[PDB]
Design a protein around this ligand. Structure first.
Ligand SMILES: COc1cccc(NC(=S)N(CCO)Cc2cc3cc(C)c(C)cc3[nH]c2=O)c1
Ligand SMILES: COc1cccc(NC(=S)N(CCO)Cc2cc3cc(C)c(C)cc3[nH]c2=O)c1
Lengths: 603, 603
């Protein structure tokens, strides 16, 4: 369906993020049968929203729980909301939600990183209290967007396994809200900026609408009406403009009016005049040779999970700004939109990514019981549904982020195994369909190191080359000397194979803060520094390398294992954001360069 | 008396350092009355020598023990030792030892950092076993060289307090040995190298001798006899030579022969042709403008105490060599001679220091019960004995180290309070007497920051200016900005006051390895780096500054207190010798310079 980011004019919101809700586990899965949502959850306790449920209670049994949990809370609908449109919206519900307003089932959602909403006017009465009950599921299976497998034990209980690193946080991770609309209402919008050698340029509106006529007006930074359009379906305004750029990120505001003889609906959609596409081995934003810096990130932090948080947000960006990141990627799931609004506002370049992670079964590291399906693409394991579920996941992200100028690229998935058979048959359609959803931006699929330049059957189908590489770490462990060869050899081997522009979307080594070594070896701070030094030395000797993003901005939490010391320790910063000695090395390189500019194959 | 470093030709040793001795505490102090040394200590256990007794057992009760402890062990005297001179030697016994060979009291010593020996021939029989019993005392009082105070509690037990930082380790910290001499024997030697504008030069022998005639011969590096002298009392040989220098440290060997008609005694005394003295604001070794780098060190390490250790020794020097130290100081006590032999051999410059530390009562940091004597120099507190005990401590160090070329300076004490009254009356005699013991080297007394350039009543009496300064740390805590002013202001204020050459013998900040901060504040690694940066920026803007030695090479152990987090954390390295991020900053500065060379008031 249609997603529009709420803002506040002929519409206003009660955020329900007001944190404390009633909470409970349903270890018997008797909750739907016993119709829990008709009265107050019993045996509950306070929980905060937004945040993951897992770590709020310091309890392993809750942390590793799998199945359904219940959220409940009450809330007076504002008196002024008349006969108006009342709309309940969740920015995310991690993995799956079902919603009961008093007794009315109003909503259902699968996907954990994108919004869903419903018109609730008929079971609500403005000026009165209404119960809100949410049922939340955190289970993953094969047609799910990260896939996974729930093993039920003989003894009654579930237990989740899956194929990615990062830990399976679940819950209401983002803002909920009740919001208000006129019965005339904008409900969809799309916008495209074309650029021309940097002198002048044009933007297209298209806009689905609740019944009404659209006056479309584009405003200055200073609110001077410099673009006007008529029509409820389409326009193009060719004004000679001020562009969205990386150092600075200028933005226009396109108000959107939908009219009836009774009503009016007014919408400001921030807009960045920017063009994105690839030319040969170059990446082009406003027809310029960019160079990417920054990291893969996660939504992870002590206590809250992947739960959204303003302070955290403000601090991390301060940190990225300081250290010279111009860009980052939404590692392995759609992030809360606020990050993107900030990126636009601040001109930060974003490779936007779907939750399609862990399609891979070789990854890995198993001393344990094998199964585990034999064929990756099978009706058993990655199947028809799964391509369809996956398709739907790509719609939504694009539905949400097409209008965010900061997004210069889409990412279809991260590290799928492309050595098994259906791997090109699975990936070709979605690659086509992606561009049929948005042809304004290039599209990639992020590449695991064992589908290497001679074995990977999928890369031509995409526009840019996104590599995750560990050459001294998982292989050649500890050996910078031979690691540098393999890496360059393999970067050159990609350059000729595909003659595409190359970005390393993951390069990094586990490092324990405070571990220091005169022998400069694995897990030491010094080693991280030497290893990043080297990867760097090597992108300076390759023309096709136009992007660099460090494995992890900060240490995050993982599934429990032998290869993870209390989590992934590959952060430049610790989880509480204290900088490892490598923050200061990246500091120099990233602020020493010219903005958006590769070195002189040296410096 | 006379000290000569054993080496092995007409003399040979059984080191008795063979570690495991029998050990016990004497909590009743009934040990001498009950004549423990007549039979095997009872209720004993194995202990290793050399090492401190305190930490070998992981026991707090033994670690904090005060009083007498007993060492005992047996050892066959070598058959070949005939009617020869048999000589028992201890390189150190920390604080005080008394020694019983079977029942014969052979020895007594107060001082913990210098050798003492005795002729044991008459109570020993070559080819047989003999008991060795040592009584060791670790108590400090006012006439002791570090001074201190033992409070006996009402309940029966002692408890030591004292006035220095470093922890009161005690025990047999260095090699013991039985050694052999002919009845003709060299027993004393002294040597002085004069240098002349770098073309040619002369060395004086003087030598006390067991009865016999001395042939004195100086050899090449390659054992070619290039200097010869006759006389059992004095010579000078003027040969045109190859000098002892800091980068490289060349050495000659002067054999020493003492003759009888029955016997011959042969002694090689390594000799470095080098001149040391001050000229104006310059420090001169072989008439050159030196610049000092390196640290204050301690004899401290996990498990062993201040006990000597070859591996430790080899590793630390590797570390100093790597990081650019050309020099160091024997912080607050005479070190094991092996360090000095190594320094000569490797050309490393050494400010040699006595155990005279803690003369100061203002230092400090007391929330607790005051007393504590009112007048520092009094018959109560630092008194006539104390100047005499102190005098004796200076003899011995000079007795031991006069022949070590690596020692370019003597240090009389460290951080005494010179604001109370007797402070110039106490210090003037020893300053005079020092030069009457060795006029070949300059002499200093190390200066605490609160006897500052306007208040310190003692500095003219010495040759070089040795300052310990903490300007952002103990005062101006955390404030590099104002700390830099005070420091420079106070360095200039010294330069004019005395127009002597200045060395900072202590500059450093407590730093926890692994503590990282974006705010670059106290106890963080980054702070240490900024603070050392700054002290440095400031010696580059002062002409009189010709020496820099970092507070601590590595973290050491201290007395328990509120200001010490498991010890002094001011090491560039942790106690297990892992480098803090500041090892790499000092690295650059120390190897970036020209050898022995201050920068161009810049670089
Ligand atoms: C199931 O969730 C978990 C749990 C714990 C660890 C991981 N590891 C992950 S995601 N990575 C991917 C790094 O981008 C490490 C990894 C690399 C790897 C490389 C090669 C060349 C081979 C042959 C096998 C490999 N196996 C691996 O596991 C995943
Ligand atoms: C008794 O054994 C201990 C136990 C614990 C700590 C110490 N501290 C020592 S030796 N230092 C000397 C540093 O070279 C720190 C120290 C500095 C200081 C400076 C000023 C200006 C004043 C007024 C008072 C001060 N007091 C101090 O204690 C000694």
């Amino acid at each position: 369906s249609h997603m529009l980011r709420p803002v506040e004019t002929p519409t206003r919101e009660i955020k329900k993020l007001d944190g404390l809700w009633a909470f409970s586990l349903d270890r018997e899965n008797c909750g739907i049968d016993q119709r829990w949502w008709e009265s107050a959850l019993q045996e509950s306790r306070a929980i905060a929203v937004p945040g993951s449920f897992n770590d709020q209670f310091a309890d392993a049994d809750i942390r590793n729980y799998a199945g359904n949990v219940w959220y409940q809370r009450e809330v007076f609908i504002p008196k002024g909301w008349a006969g108006q449109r009342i709309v309940l919206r969740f920015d995310a519900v991690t993995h799956y939600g079902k919603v009961w307003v008093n007794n009315q089932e109003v909503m259902e959602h699968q996907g954990g990183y994108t919004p869903f909403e419903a018109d609730v006017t008929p079971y609500v009465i403005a000026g009165k209290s209404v119960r809100i009950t949410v049922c939340v599921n955190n289970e993953l299976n094969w047609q799910t967007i990260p896939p996974g497998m729930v093993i039920t034990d003989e003894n009654g209980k579930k237990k989740q396994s899956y194929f990615h690193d990062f830990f399976n946080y679940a819950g209401i991770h983002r803002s909920v809200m009740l919001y208000t609309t006129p019965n005339t209402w904008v409900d969809d919008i799309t916008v495209v900026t074309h650029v021309a050698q940097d002198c002048n340029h044009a933007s297209v509106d298209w806009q689905v609408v609740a019944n009404g006529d659209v006056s479309v007006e584009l405003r200055d930074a200073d609110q001077q009406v410099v673009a006007t359009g008529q029509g409820t379906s389409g326009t193009l305004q060719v004004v000679n403009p001020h562009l969205w750029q990386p150092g600075e990120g200028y933005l226009y505001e396109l108000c959107v009016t939908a009219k009836s003889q009774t009503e009016c609906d007014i919408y400001p959609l921030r807009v960045g005049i920017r063009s994105v596409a690839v030319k040969g081995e170059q990446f082009l934003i406003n027809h310029k040779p960019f160079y990417f810096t920054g990291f893969g990130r996660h939504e992870d932090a002590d206590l809250r999970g992947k739960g959204f948080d303003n302070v955290l947000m403000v601090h991390d960006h301060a940190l990225m700004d300081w250290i010279g990141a111009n860009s980052y990627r939404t590692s392995h799931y759609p992030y809360a939109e606020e990050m993107l609004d900030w990126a636009d506002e601040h001109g930060i370049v974003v490779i936007d990514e779907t939750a399609a992670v862990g399609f891979n079964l070789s990854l890995g590291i198993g001393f344990e019981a094998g199964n585990k399906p034999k064929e990756l693409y099978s009706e058993e394991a990655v199947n028809g549904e799964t391509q369809q579920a996956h398709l739907q996941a790509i719609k939504e992200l694009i539905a949400r982020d097409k209008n965010h100028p900061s997004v210069v690229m889409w990412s279809i998935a991260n590290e799928p195994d492309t050595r098994p058979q259906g791997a090109r048959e699975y990936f070709a359609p979605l690659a086509e369909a992606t561009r049929k959803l948005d042809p304004t931006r290039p599209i990639t699929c992020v590449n695991v190191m064992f589908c290497d330049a001679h074995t990977d059957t999928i890369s031509d189908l995409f526009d840019v080359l996104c590599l995750n590489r560990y050459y001294g770490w998982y292989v050649q462990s500890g050996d910078l000397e031979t690691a540098e060869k393999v890496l360059e050899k393999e970067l050159l081997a990609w350059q000729e194979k595909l003659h595409q522009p190359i970005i390393i979307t993951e390069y990094g080594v586990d490092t324990l803060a405070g571990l220091h070594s005169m022998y400069t070896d694995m897990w030491s701070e010094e080693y991280q520094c030497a290893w990043l030094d080297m990867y760097h030395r090597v992108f300076d000797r390759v023309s096709a390398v136009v992007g660099e993003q460090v494995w992890n901005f900060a240490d995050f939490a993982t599934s429990q294992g032998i290869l993870r010391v209390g989590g992934n320790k590959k952060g430049i910063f610790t989880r509480d954001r204290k900088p490892k000695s490598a923050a200061f090395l990246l500091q120099k390189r990233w602020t020493g360069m010219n903005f958006g500019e590769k070195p002189q194959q040296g410096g």
